[PDB]
Design a protein around this motif. Structure first.
Motif, PDB file in Angstrom:
ATOM      1  N   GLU A  54      -3.123  -3.353  21.678  1.00 36.49           N
ATOM      2  CA  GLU A  54      -3.153  -2.652  20.407  1.00 36.49           C
ATOM      3  C   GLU A  54      -2.499  -3.482  19.307  1.00 36.49           C
ATOM      4  OE1 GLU A  54      -0.850   0.879  21.663  1.00 36.49           O
ATOM      5  OE2 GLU A  54       0.492   0.350  20.011  1.00 36.49           O
ATOM      6  N   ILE A  55      -2.889  -3.192  18.070  1.00 38.87           N
ATOM      7  CA  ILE A  55      -2.227  -3.712  16.879  1.00 38.87           C
ATOM      8  C   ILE A  55      -2.074  -2.542  15.917  1.00 38.87           C
ATOM      9  CG2 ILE A  55      -2.331  -5.300  14.918  1.00 38.87           C
ATOM     10  CD1 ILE A  55      -4.168  -7.110  16.635  1.00 38.87           C
ATOM     11  N   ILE A  56      -0.839  -2.290  15.484  1.00 41.54           N
ATOM     12  CA  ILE A  56      -0.575  -1.242  14.501  1.00 41.54           C
ATOM     13  C   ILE A  56      -0.337  -1.875  13.133  1.00 41.54           C
ATOM     14  CG2 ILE A  56       0.938   0.669  13.808  1.00 41.54           C
ATOM     15  CD1 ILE A  56       1.564   1.092  16.814  1.00 41.54           C
ATOM     16  N   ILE A  57      -1.033  -1.335  12.132  1.00 42.16           N
ATOM     17  CA  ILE A  57      -0.936  -1.782  10.744  1.00 42.16           C
ATOM     18  C   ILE A  57      -0.358  -0.658   9.888  1.00 42.16           C
ATOM     19  CG2 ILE A  57      -2.255  -2.469   8.683  1.00 42.16           C
ATOM     20  CD1 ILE A  57      -4.469  -3.432  10.826  1.00 42.16           C
ATOM     21  N   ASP A  58       0.673  -0.985   9.109  1.00 40.26           N
ATOM     22  CA  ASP A  58       1.185  -0.110   8.058  1.00 40.26           C
ATOM     23  C   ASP A  58       0.524  -0.550   6.763  1.00 40.26           C
ATOM     24  OD1 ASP A  58       2.597   1.394   6.186  1.00 40.26           O
ATOM     25  OD2 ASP A  58       4.584   0.711   6.814  1.00 40.26           O
ATOM     26  N   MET A  59      -0.356   0.292   6.227  1.00 36.67           N
ATOM     27  CA  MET A  59      -1.055  -0.057   4.994  1.00 36.67           C
ATOM     28  C   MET A  59      -0.165   0.056   3.759  1.00 36.67           C
ATOM     29  SD  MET A  59      -5.041   1.502   5.579  1.00 36.67           S
ATOM     30  CE  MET A  59      -4.363   3.275   6.006  1.00 36.67           C
ATOM     31  N   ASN A  60       0.921   0.822   3.875  1.00 36.84           N
ATOM     32  CA  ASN A  60       1.835   1.063   2.753  1.00 36.84           C
ATOM     33  C   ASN A  60       1.119   1.753   1.594  1.00 36.84           C
ATOM     34  OD1 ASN A  60       4.639   0.005   3.474  1.00 36.84           O
ATOM     35  ND2 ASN A  60       3.301  -1.671   4.142  1.00 36.84           N
ATOM     36  N   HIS A  61       0.055   2.458   1.966  1.00 33.05           N
ATOM     37  CA  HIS A  61      -0.702   3.355   1.103  1.00 33.05           C
ATOM     38  C   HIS A  61      -1.244   4.451   2.005  1.00 33.05           C
ATOM     39  CE1 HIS A  61      -0.676   0.575  -2.299  1.00 33.05           C
ATOM     40  NE2 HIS A  61      -0.933  -0.386  -1.433  1.00 33.05           N
ATOM     41  N   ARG A  62      -1.424   5.648   1.456  1.00 31.48           N
ATOM     42  CA  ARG A  62      -2.094   6.728   2.170  1.00 31.48           C
ATOM     43  C   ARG A  62      -3.564   6.652   1.794  1.00 31.48           C
ATOM     44  NH1 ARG A  62      -1.759  13.237   1.401  1.00 31.48           N
ATOM     45  NH2 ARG A  62      -2.519  13.766   3.509  1.00 31.48           N
ATOM     46  N   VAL A  63      -4.441   6.672   2.794  1.00 27.72           N
ATOM     47  CA  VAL A  63      -5.858   6.396   2.581  1.00 27.72           C
ATOM     48  C   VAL A  63      -6.725   7.424   3.284  1.00 27.72           C
ATOM     49  CG1 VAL A  63      -7.736   4.748   3.019  1.00 27.72           C
ATOM     50  CG2 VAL A  63      -5.472   3.897   2.375  1.00 27.72           C
ATOM     51  N   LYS A  64      -7.696   7.974   2.558  1.00 33.63           N
ATOM     52  CA  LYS A  64      -8.774   8.733   3.183  1.00 33.63           C
ATOM     53  C   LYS A  64      -9.811   7.721   3.650  1.00 33.63           C
ATOM     54  CE  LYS A  64     -11.938  12.631   2.652  1.00 33.63           C
ATOM     55  NZ  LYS A  64     -12.445  13.685   1.730  1.00 33.63           N
ATOM     56  N   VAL A 114     -15.963   5.757  11.363  1.00 27.37           N
ATOM     57  CA  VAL A 114     -14.909   6.496  12.044  1.00 27.37           C
ATOM     58  C   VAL A 114     -14.905   7.975  11.648  1.00 27.37           C
ATOM     59  CG1 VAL A 114     -13.440   4.455  12.336  1.00 27.37           C
ATOM     60  CG2 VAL A 114     -13.181   5.881  10.267  1.00 27.37           C
ATOM     61  N   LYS A 115     -14.263   8.798  12.475  1.00 33.66           N
ATOM     62  CA  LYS A 115     -13.964  10.177  12.111  1.00 33.66           C
ATOM     63  C   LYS A 115     -13.212  10.165  10.786  1.00 33.66           C
ATOM     64  CE  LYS A 115     -11.403  14.258  13.709  1.00 33.66           C
ATOM     65  NZ  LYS A 115     -10.709  14.863  14.877  1.00 33.66           N
ATOM     66  N   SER A 116     -13.668  10.974   9.831  1.00 34.13           N
ATOM     67  CA  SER A 116     -12.976  11.120   8.552  1.00 34.13           C
ATOM     68  C   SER A 116     -11.521  11.483   8.808  1.00 34.13           C
ATOM     69  CB  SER A 116     -13.648  12.191   7.693  1.00 34.13           C
ATOM     70  OG  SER A 116     -13.035  12.265   6.417  1.00 34.13           O
ATOM     71  N   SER A 117     -10.611  10.711   8.223  1.00 36.03           N
ATOM     72  CA  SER A 117      -9.193  10.849   8.506  1.00 36.03           C
ATOM     73  C   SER A 117      -8.388  10.311   7.343  1.00 36.03           C
ATOM     74  CB  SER A 117      -8.834  10.077   9.775  1.00 36.03           C
ATOM     75  OG  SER A 117      -9.382   8.772   9.736  1.00 36.03           O
ATOM     76  N   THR A 118      -7.186  10.849   7.170  1.00 39.86           N
ATOM     77  CA  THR A 118      -6.256  10.391   6.143  1.00 39.86           C
ATOM     78  C   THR A 118      -5.005   9.868   6.834  1.00 39.86           C
ATOM     79  OG1 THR A 118      -7.151  11.977   4.549  1.00 39.86           O
ATOM     80  CG2 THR A 118      -5.004  11.009   4.035  1.00 39.86           C
ATOM     81  N   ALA A 119      -4.560   8.681   6.431  1.00 40.17           N
ATOM     82  CA  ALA A 119      -3.521   7.986   7.172  1.00 40.17           C
ATOM     83  C   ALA A 119      -2.835   6.921   6.339  1.00 40.17           C
ATOM     84  CB  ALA A 119      -4.114   7.343   8.430  1.00 40.17           C
ATOM     85  N   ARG A 120      -1.592   6.621   6.705  1.00 44.47           N
ATOM     86  CA  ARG A 120      -0.889   5.440   6.219  1.00 44.47           C
ATOM     87  C   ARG A 120      -0.977   4.293   7.231  1.00 44.47           C
ATOM     88  NH1 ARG A 120       5.490   4.935   4.290  1.00 44.47           N
ATOM     89  NH2 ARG A 120       5.689   2.727   4.896  1.00 44.47           N
ATOM     90  N   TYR A 121      -1.088   4.637   8.518  1.00 46.84           N
ATOM     91  CA  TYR A 121      -1.089   3.660   9.601  1.00 46.84           C
ATOM     92  C   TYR A 121      -2.401   3.719  10.355  1.00 46.84           C
ATOM     93  CZ  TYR A 121       4.003   4.149   8.951  1.00 46.84           C
ATOM     94  OH  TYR A 121       5.278   4.221   8.436  1.00 46.84           O
ATOM     95  N   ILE A 122      -2.884   2.546  10.751  1.00 41.60           N
ATOM     96  CA  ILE A 122      -4.053   2.457  11.608  1.00 41.60           C
ATOM     97  C   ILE A 122      -3.737   1.584  12.815  1.00 41.60           C
ATOM     98  CG2 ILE A 122      -5.747   2.998   9.793  1.00 41.60           C
ATOM     99  CD1 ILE A 122      -6.234  -0.012   9.549  1.00 41.60           C
ATOM    100  N   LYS A 123      -4.466   1.828  13.895  1.00 41.42           N
ATOM    101  CA  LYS A 123      -4.252   1.122  15.145  1.00 41.42           C
ATOM    102  C   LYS A 123      -5.593   0.700  15.709  1.00 41.42           C
ATOM    103  CE  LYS A 123      -1.444   3.165  18.086  1.00 41.42           C
ATOM    104  NZ  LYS A 123      -1.138   4.304  18.983  1.00 41.42           N
ATOM    105  N   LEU A 124      -5.727  -0.602  15.946  1.00 42.18           N
ATOM    106  CA  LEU A 124      -6.833  -1.155  16.711  1.00 42.18           C
ATOM    107  C   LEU A 124      -6.432  -1.171  18.180  1.00 42.18           C
ATOM    108  CD1 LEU A 124      -9.478  -2.920  17.186  1.00 42.18           C
ATOM    109  CD2 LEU A 124      -8.006  -4.881  16.667  1.00 42.18           C
ATOM    110  N   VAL A 125      -7.314  -0.659  19.038  1.00 38.39           N
ATOM    111  CA  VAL A 125      -7.087  -0.649  20.478  1.00 38.39           C
ATOM    112  C   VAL A 125      -8.257  -1.321  21.186  1.00 38.39           C
ATOM    113  CG1 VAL A 125      -6.706   0.807  22.526  1.00 38.39           C
ATOM    114  CG2 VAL A 125      -5.719   1.461  20.332  1.00 38.39           C
ATOM    115  N   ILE A 126      -7.924  -2.251  22.078  1.00 37.06           N
ATOM    116  CA  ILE A 126      -8.885  -2.873  22.984  1.00 37.06           C
ATOM    117  C   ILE A 126      -8.555  -2.328  24.377  1.00 37.06           C
ATOM    118  CG2 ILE A 126      -9.813  -5.056  23.879  1.00 37.06           C
ATOM    119  CD1 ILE A 126      -9.046  -6.372  21.251  1.00 37.06           C
ATOM    120  N   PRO A 127      -9.283  -1.283  24.808  1.00 32.40           N
ATOM    121  CA  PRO A 127      -8.892  -0.594  26.040  1.00 32.40           C
ATOM    122  C   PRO A 127      -9.153  -1.360  27.336  1.00 32.40           C
ATOM    123  CG  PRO A 127     -10.940   0.332  25.191  1.00 32.40           C
ATOM    124  CD  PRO A 127     -10.444  -0.643  24.154  1.00 32.40           C
TER     125      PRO A 127
END
Length: 149
Positions: A54-64, A114-127
């Motif tokens: 996984e990689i977690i990103i803090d966008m430092n913005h809230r995003v729809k 992606v599923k419509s979502s609002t977030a400050r953080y996103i995560k890429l996962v390679i399962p």
């Protein structure tokens, strides 16, 4: 209408290549530097790390969020990622799945609805368990959506 990544930061990651690609390539930060010629790569020098990644990103913005893009290494490289997943979080602690998608090592960006979502953080996962291997390389992750004011 890809969003500016200038304020984005890598929070954490399972694996990166911190040495084998030199100082200016291979690191998790190279996923979000806006440089097409750099990529995050999973670790290979000194041995691999086991899936999942996984990689977690803090966008430092809230995003729809409307779409996420991944720009593969491409160019005939060995980069046999098959399946990716994304998660999103408002607070950084509570995570929601926003979809599972295919990957192919093409040159053009892969566009993920992606599923419509609002977030400050996103995560890429390679399962694990889906035939991904320990070789993974991505030039850019981008988000299309709208910053919430």
């Amino acid at each position: 209408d890809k969003l500016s990544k200038t304020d984005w930061k890598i929070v954490s990651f399972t694996t990166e290549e911190a040495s084998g690609e030199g100082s200016n390539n291979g690191h998790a930060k190279h996923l979000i530097d806006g440089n097409i010629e750099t990529f995050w790569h999973s670790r290979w020098q000194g041995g691999s790390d086991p899936l999942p990644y996984e990689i977690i990103i803090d966008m430092n913005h809230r995003v729809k969020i409307a779409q996420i893009e991944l720009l593969p290494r491409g160019r005939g490289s060995n980069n046999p990622i098959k399946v990716v997943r994304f998660e999103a979080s408002e607070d950084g602690t509570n995570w929601e799945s926003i979809g599972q998608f295919g990957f192919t090592n093409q040159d053009a960006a892969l566009k993920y609805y992606v599923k419509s979502s609002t977030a400050r953080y996103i995560k890429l996962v390679i399962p694990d368990g889906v035939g991904n291997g320990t070789v993974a390389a991505i030039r850019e992750l981008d988000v299309r959506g709208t910053v919430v004011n």
